[PDB]
Amino acid sequence: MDKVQYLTRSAIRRASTIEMPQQAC
């Protein structure tokens, strides 16, 4: 679940890191 939720997040995370910053913390 955490592994599946990790990739799922990396999907939006990668598509949600253009305007605003986002690196782990």
From Swiss-Prot:
The modification Phosphoserine is found at residue 16. The modification Phosphothreonine is found at residue 17. It is found in: Endoplasmic reticulum membrane; Sarcoplasmic reticulum membrane; Mitochondrion membrane; Membrane. Residues 1-24 are cytoplasmic. Homopentamer. Can also form heterooligomers with other sarcoplasmic/endoplasmic reticulum calcium ATPase (SERCA) regulators ARLN, ERLN, SLN and STRIT1/DWORF. Monomer. Interacts with HAX1. Interacts as a monomer with ATP2A2; the interaction decreases ATP2A2 Ca(2+) affinity. Interacts with VMP1; VMP1 competes with PLN and SLN to prevent them from forming an inhibitory complex with ATP2A2. Interacts with S100A1 in a Ca(2+)-dependent manner. For practical reasons, PLN activity is most often studied with ATP2A1 instead of ATP2A2. Reversibly inhibits the activity of ATP2A2/SERCA2 in cardiac sarcoplasmic reticulum by decreasing the apparent affinity of the ATPase for Ca(2+). Binds preferentially to the ATP-bound E1 conformational form of ATP2A2 which predominates at low Ca(2+) concentrations during the diastolic phase of the cardiac cycle. Inhibits ATP2A2 Ca(2+) affinity by disrupting its allosteric activation by ATP. Modulates the contractility of the heart muscle in response to physiological stimuli via its effects on ATP2A2. Changing residue 17 to A: No effect on phosphorylation by PKA. Belongs to the phospholamban family. The modification N-acetylmethionine is found at residue 1. It is linked to Cardiomyopathy, dilated, 1P: A disorder characterized by ventricular dilation and impaired systolic function, resulting in congestive heart failure and arrhythmia. Patients are at risk of premature death. This is Phospholamban. Phosphorylation by PKA abolishes the inhibition of ATP2A2-mediated calcium uptake. Phosphorylated at Thr-17 by CaMK2, and in response to beta-adrenergic stimulation. Phosphorylation by DMPK may stimulate sarcoplasmic reticulum calcium uptake in cardiomyocytes. Palmitoylated by ZDHHC16, promoting formation of the homopentamer. Heart muscle (at protein level). Residues 16-22 are annotated as: Involved in HAX1 binding. Changing residue 9 to C: In CMD1P; impairs phosphorylation by PKA and inhibition of ATP2A1-mediated calcium uptake. Changing residue 14 to A: Abolishes phosphorylation by PKA.
